[PDB]
Write a protein that binds this ligand. Sequence first.
Ligand SMILES: [Zn+2]
Length: 251
Amino acid sequence: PELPEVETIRRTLLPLIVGKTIEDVRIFWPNIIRHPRDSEAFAARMIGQTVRGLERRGKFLKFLLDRDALISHLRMEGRYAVASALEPLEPHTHVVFCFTDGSELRYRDVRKFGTMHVYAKEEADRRPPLAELGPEPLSPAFSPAVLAERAVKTKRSVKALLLDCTVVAGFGNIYVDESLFRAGILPGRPAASLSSKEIERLHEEMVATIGEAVMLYVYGRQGNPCKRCGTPIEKTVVAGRGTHYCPRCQR
DNA sequence: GGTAGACCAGGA
DNA sequence: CCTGGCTAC
Ligand SMILES: [Zn+2]
């Protein structure tokens, strides 16, 4: 799930779990649990706490309980569902939170790449994985000035810069390629080579692209005609990722 | 201090 | 082979 999908999960999942009290936590793939390191301590500490809220930071979900926060990243295929404890579990269910009302919050992840960290609420923002997280892309805290400052002080590509969670929170591969196309900038350009005008343009397209999605031109379209000029879209590797662009319209 | 690289783990 | 967000040059 990308940022807009995580925002949808946050909004839709909250009313399905708010006010429920945890009676048990069952873990079927302990590697998902990253803090406490011991999955038995993770399960034990959550028992007896009631769900009070659900927030999002980048692509992280922050479940707010009584004393603790549970910070969850779904990576590529993680999914949450609420259902009855009476029914058989679906495949790839790796963590289940059992509530006192006989319902459960189930975490499924065929890839097993997702992560869970639990800390006292007041500690969560200063611990992994939230600690060094950059500003929300749709917030005033993410500005052209902030982007420009990061761009000039790196030798990396502009794509590598945008994928960096410390620069801007949760801006995924798909939106990086789409935004760069909409801004007319090649993904392999050194970040430090962007002009002031290019940085402002890029900022505007990043906000427009992810904003529209929260409320495709190139991604996955290799070999197909550009929707703007008809030139076939190309795919290469940039910043170690599949990268799509129009070689005519991006410079 | 920056930055590349390892790392995870299963469906094509 | 692709992929989001602790180690070691
Ligand atoms: Zn084009």
